[PDB]
């Protein structure tokens with residue numbers, strides 16, 4: 001579990017699935033146990049709902065059809081993916097992230113209606 | 123949330139994601155605080171299970187391979203998708219609704235077993 | 245030929261019942277966790293409310309059939325029980341009392357009775373003689389009395405009481421209700437919307453506005469004002485059993501005070517438990533009362549008569565006193581500062597109004613203030629005794645409280661001789677009628693995000 | 706529910722949806738009802754999480770791209786899919802299964818990373 005937390009993003013592409021494998025595994029104490037189980041269920045369901053909203057659910061790696069904006073862009077591809085780890089990258093993408101998800105959502109929606117604009121004439 | 127409730131189905135075909143976007147986020151009081159989260163989790167997981175059974179889960183528009191019966195049919199396509207609104211259309215489509223889910227389930231099972239009978243040799 | 249399709253996230257709903265949950269206004273509760281309504285435990289509403297108007301939406305509403313008012317009535321009762329549960333009980337205090345007059349002369353108020361009794365100390369075998377002051381509605385002369393000084397409490401042949409804890413603060417902190425995720429709240433926006441009907445302007449919201457749990461009868465206090473027009477709501481308007489809710493457009497400012505300098509003493513009862521009582525009155529005793537600006541009240545009554553005679557044509561309305569009955573029912577009852585008031589209200593509801601605008605004297609300048617006397621009870625059995633009876637502890641110093649009258653609870657005294665002069669009286673008693681005036685707007689619905697439609701669109705295979 | 710439990714696997718191959726269609730949601734008593742609903746939500750979410758790990762979620766029959774080891778192999782295909790029933794077969798396939806789950810997980814991760822390496826140059 002978290003076996004490549006200090007490695008690069010290339011290495012974590014082998015480990016990441018087993019992290020998901022631990023996302024659901026497992027009168028005062030009974031109350032606390034009930035609270036823990038409810039919290040775990042909510043935490044697992046939230047990001048799965050977000051993945052289903054973006055439409056790329058069911059797979060670990062998503063391709064988005066959304067262009068990366070230049071205001072977010074400061075580093076190169078090899079500067080990110082081979083020099084440094086996930087934690088500092090999340091620290092520096094703490095900015096601007098809170099809109100990006102919604103963009104994916106509406107982009108996903110456009111694809112669906114475009115698919116409908118094919119599938120009605122399929 | 124529900125930003126196009128009174129519009130037509132063609133107009134609601136762009137804003138159908140904002141309804142599902144907010145379905146999971148938001149000692150006398152503590153009991154109700156627990157109860158609300160439990161009810162929300164159950165309500166989301168119900169129709170997520172139904173979309174999983176029908177096989178068109180992961181997308182907001184389902185292509186079904188089930189023929190529309192003539193007993194259900196009274197209006198034209200332009201009469202529905204340009205003139206009619208969802209909320210009042212639900213009233214008239216409340217009839218015959220209960221068998222549609224079973225028809226979708228059996229059609230999905232037939233499609234999966236035909237795909238297995240194909241790909242076992244193909 | 246045609247092909248069925250199903251869509252996820254459609255904007256349709258249905259009527260349903262569900263369990264709501266509280267949400268405060270992110271007030272600084274870190275000092276005030278000892279509020280009686282326990283509003284600190286609610287989830288704070290951080291952002292702006294989702295004031296989302298729909299447009300092209302009409303729906304029928306019925307606030308007399310709303311589930312929400314009964315749920316919040318049960319929540320208030322349960323909050324009262326759970327707040328009053330860990331406090332101190334008064335079972336050893338129910339003993340024989342010997343009472344005399346503490347007030348020098350009968351005066352205009354003398355009801356502060358002096359009494360003496362016996363109590364148990366920390367040691368079981370040590371009885372101690374003690375004294376306390378009480379009010380005349382609290383004490384009852386003992387059975388088979390020979391006009392003696394023998395007295396007891398009112399509750400002792402009904403049920404035991406518990407005193408309120410002194411840390412408990414009875415300030416009506418505003419409370420929001422929020423539906424769970426997957427449900428929704430629809431509210432009306434039509435400006436002249438009565439209790440029932442189709443609302444042409446309907447907006448959804450995640451959480452309701454800051455309604456207040458004000459404990460009062462016969463006069464709604466600090467409620468949400470009517471936006472432009474005085475609203476009359478009644479379930480039938482021709483049955484006298486249906487209580488008329490009058491929603492005023494403009495507030496009427498009311499002041500209430502107990503003038504005398506009351507003092508608080510303490511009595512040890514049992515192992516590690518204390519009791520609080522009135523010890524002495526400092527200074528000259530004066531009458532507890534309330535003050536209302538008379539001109540504004542008269543103009544408000546005139547406009548209410550206009551709004552009622554347009555519902556009842558060719559009938560003069562007589563604002564008369566309420567029907568006779570108990571102290572808690574006839575008198576206007578409330579609490580402010582932590583003490584409980586019962587006000588006489590005979591001269592308040594004393595007038596009439598016909599089709600003629602009787603009073604252009606409201607246009608003249610005046611400073612007339614009606615003053616009505618009030619009395620004070622220590623022991624209450626409100627909500628018809630479904631909760632445990634609360635002994636209000638006395639509070640040192642004087643008490644002053646200010647409020648806005650925003651609504652009235654009226655009944656139609658449908659007499660036989662009311663062919664032209666109709667009688668309307670104050671009413672109350674059912675505390676959910678106080679809350680139906682505030683929950684008139686809201687409604688709970690359930691989202692059903694799946695839809696069925698044909699498009700002649702075939703799945704690939 | 707469980708209307709074909711005594712039949713063979715090929716005979717249950719068209720009836721396997723009746724199990725899943727009733728899996729989810731088919732003061733002492735209130736405590737028990739709360740416990741029951743929480744248990745049902747957990748038991749439904751567990752195997753759905755496992756299918757999401759294996760990537761073949763959303764369908765009832767999974768093709769795996771994992772070779773069947775000879776140590777697990779004793780019977781023929783016609784010996785299984787015509788002569789054998791699921792319940793007694795579970796007794797003999799009770800071995801090796803926890804290894805099989807991890808093998809499916811790592812093979813799915815390898816498939817995802819190969820698909821990412823292909824689609825990065827797409």
Ligand SMILES: *[C@@H]1O[C@H](CO)[C@@H](O[C@@H]2O[C@H](CO)[C@@H](O[C@@H]3O[C@H](CO)[C@@H](O)[C@H](O)[C@H]3NC(C)=O)[C@H](O)[C@H]2NC(C)=O)[C@H](O)[C@H]1NC(C)=O
Nearest residue numbers: 465466467469493494495496497498645646647648649650
């Ligand atoms: C009873 O009704 C009164 C009116 O009839 C209310 O009095 C008004 O309350 C408003 C809000 O409490 C005040 O507005 C505030 O005024 C101050 C000073 O001018 C400003 O700094 C604030 O920004 C402003 N806030 C808002 C939201 O407007 C009014 O000044 C005040 N007076 C009048 C004449 O309107 C009482 O609040 C109301 N309730 C009680 C308990 O008395």
Ligand SMILES: *[C@@H]1O[C@H](CO)[C@@H](O[C@@H]2O[C@H](CO)[C@@H](O[C@@H]3O[C@H](CO)[C@@H](O)[C@H](O)[C@@H]3O)[C@H](O)[C@H]2NC(C)=O)[C@H](O)[C@H]1NC(C)=O
Nearest residue numbers: 344345346347357358359360373374375376377523524525
């Ligand atoms: C209500 O009635 C009680 C009962 O009589 C009054 O209490 C009495 O108060 C007086 C003075 O206020 C006490 O007298 C004092 O006694 C002590 C000895 O105990 C003595 O040292 C003092 O010099 C003084 O004489 C009296 O003892 C006390 N009695 C009891 C039983 O408590 C009380 O004052 C009355 N309240 C009012 C507002 O009149």
Ligand SMILES: *[C@@H]1O[C@H](CO)[C@@H](O[C@@H]2O[C@H](CO)[C@@H](O[C@@H]3O[C@H](CO)[C@@H](O)[C@H](O)[C@@H]3O)[C@H](O)[C@H]2NC(C)=O)[C@H](O)[C@H]1NC(C)=O
Nearest residue numbers: 380381382383384385386387397398399400401402403570
């Ligand atoms: C507990 O004790 C109290 C105190 O006595 C009881 O209340 C009493 O109930 C009687 C019966 O209703 C009341 O008598 C009534 O008096 C009015 C005039 O005030 C008269 O018009 C009626 O016809 C009737 O005679 C009495 O006033 C009332 N006393 C008080 C102080 O409220 C109560 O009933 C007892 N409860 C139990 C369960 O024993």
Ligand SMILES: *[C@@H]1O[C@H](CO)[C@@H](O[C@@H]2O[C@H](CO)[C@@H](O[C@@H]3O[C@H](CO)[C@@H](O)[C@H](O)[C@@H]3O)[C@H](O)[C@H]2NC(C)=O)[C@H](O)[C@H]1NC(C)=O
Nearest residue numbers: 306308309440478479480481482483484485486487656658
């Ligand atoms: C609200 O109150 C009204 C009364 O204004 C109820 O409506 C119906 O009113 C008529 C007369 O206005 C009642 O008819 C009466 O019938 C008796 C016996 O048949 C007869 O002796 C009288 O001379 C008169 O004709 C009628 O009973 C009454 N309806 C009912 C069901 O009692 C109305 O029902 C009330 N409720 C609602 C929801 O509107």
Ligand SMILES: *[C@@H]1O[C@H](CO)[C@@H](O[C@@H]2O[C@H](CO)[C@@H](O[C@@H]3O[C@H](CO)[C@@H](O)[C@H](O)[C@@H]3O)[C@H](O)[C@H]2NC(C)=O)[C@H](O)[C@H]1NC(C)=O
Nearest residue numbers: 565566567568569570571573574575587588589590591617
């Ligand atoms: C609220 O305040 C009003 C106003 O004082 C009270 O009404 C008054 O009650 C007294 C009884 O203490 C009445 O006095 C008696 O009236 C009879 C009948 O005329 C008379 O024969 C007696 O000699 C005595 O004067 C008084 O008439 C009555 N009305 C007024 C205008 O003073 C009322 O009792 C108070 N309480 C409630 C709960 O309403």
Ligand SMILES: *[C@@H]1O[C@H](CO)[C@@H](O[C@@H]2O[C@H](CO)[C@@H](O[C@@H]3O[C@H](CO)[C@@H](O)[C@H](O)[C@@H]3O)[C@H](O)[C@H]2NC(C)=O)[C@H](O)[C@H]1NC(C)=O
Nearest residue numbers: 538539542543545546563594595596597602603604605606
């Ligand atoms: C405050 O409100 C009251 C009532 O809403 C107004 O007082 C009422 O004034 C009318 C005349 O302006 C009085 O009518 C007269 O009553 C006597 C009674 O016998 C009758 O003989 C006369 O022919 C006439 O109908 C009415 O009695 C009176 N009501 C009361 C309770 O005094 C008053 O004008 C209002 N004042 C302001 C400043 O708004």
Ligand SMILES: *[C@@H]1O[C@H](CO)[C@@H](O[C@@H]2O[C@H](CO)[C@@H](O[C@@H]3O[C@H](CO)[C@@H](O)[C@H](O)[C@@H]3O)[C@H](O)[C@H]2NC(C)=O)[C@H](O)[C@H]1NC(C)=O
Nearest residue numbers: 499500501502503504505581639640641642643644645646
């Ligand atoms: C106890 O009683 C005293 C005396 O009645 C109360 O004091 C009075 O309080 C009111 C408002 O609370 C004062 O009115 C306002 O005073 C300010 C200046 O202080 C003035 O700018 C306003 O226009 C308005 O007149 C009133 O003056 C004041 N009177 C005195 C003699 O201090 C006190 O509020 C009561 N306390 C409690 C806790 O009940």
Ligand SMILES: *[C@@H]1O[C@H](CO)[C@@H](O[C@@H]2O[C@H](CO)[C@@H](O)[C@H](O)[C@H]2NC(C)=O)[C@H](O)[C@H]1NC(C)=O
Nearest residue numbers: 340341342343359360361362363371372373374
């Ligand atoms: C409180 O208890 C005292 C005793 O501790 C009571 O005083 C007795 O009352 C009876 C009845 O009149 C007399 O016969 C005794 O002589 C009294 N004194 C004693 C020492 O027993 C008193 O009545 C009780 N009640 C009150 C209100 O003081």
Ligand SMILES: *[C@@H]1O[C@H](CO)[C@@H](O[C@@H]2O[C@H](CO)[C@@H](O)[C@H](O)[C@H]2NC(C)=O)[C@H](O)[C@H]1NC(C)=O
Nearest residue numbers: 294295296297298432433434435444445446447
């Ligand atoms: C329907 O109701 C909505 C909300 O109650 C109204 O929207 C408000 O309109 C006023 C002016 O008419 C604005 O000052 C407010 O800012 C609006 N509210 C919001 C949240 O922006 C709307 O006008 C009403 N429409 C009708 C026809 O009654």
Ligand SMILES: *[C@@H]1O[C@H](CO)[C@@H](O[C@@H]2O[C@H](CO)[C@@H](O)[C@H](O)[C@H]2NC(C)=O)[C@H](O)[C@H]1NC(C)=O
Nearest residue numbers: 562563564565566567568593594595596657667
């Ligand atoms: C307020 O209502 C009371 C109800 O009792 C009225 O008192 C009655 O008045 C009529 C007038 O003719 C008398 O015949 C009755 O005998 C009275 N009943 C009692 C119990 O006194 C009172 O008059 C009304 N007041 C107003 C201003 O309408």
Ligand SMILES: *[C@@H]1O[C@H](CO)[C@@H](O[C@@H]2O[C@H](CO)[C@@H](O)[C@H](O)[C@H]2NC(C)=O)[C@H](O)[C@H]1NC(C)=O
Nearest residue numbers: 563564565566588589590591592593594595596
């Ligand atoms: C209702 O108001 C009327 C009008 O003020 C009161 O009638 C007056 O009462 C006083 C009190 O003794 C008399 O001095 C006046 O002569 C009365 N005027 C008239 C025209 O009758 C009446 O008493 C009030 N009633 C109540 C119950 O408050």
Ligand SMILES: *[C@@H]1O[C@H](CO)[C@@H](O)[C@H](O)[C@H]1NC(C)=O
Nearest residue numbers: 438439440441478479480481
């Ligand atoms: C309330 O208003 C509706 C129309 O807005 C009307 O049909 C109904 O009779 C009214 N009811 C009352 C009690 O005023």
Ligand SMILES: *[C@@H]1O[C@H](CO)[C@@H](O)[C@H](O)[C@H]1NC(C)=O
Nearest residue numbers: 553554557558559598599600
């Ligand atoms: C009833 O009142 C109206 C105005 O209030 C008036 O025009 C009408 O004449 C009255 N009815 C009768 C029968 O006088």
Ligand SMILES: *[C@@H]1O[C@H](CO)[C@@H](O)[C@H](O)[C@H]1NC(C)=O
Nearest residue numbers: 560597598599600601602603
């Ligand atoms: C209404 O009452 C007032 C009271 O002074 C009177 O002047 C007026 O004539 C009355 N109007 C009717 C229609 O009775």
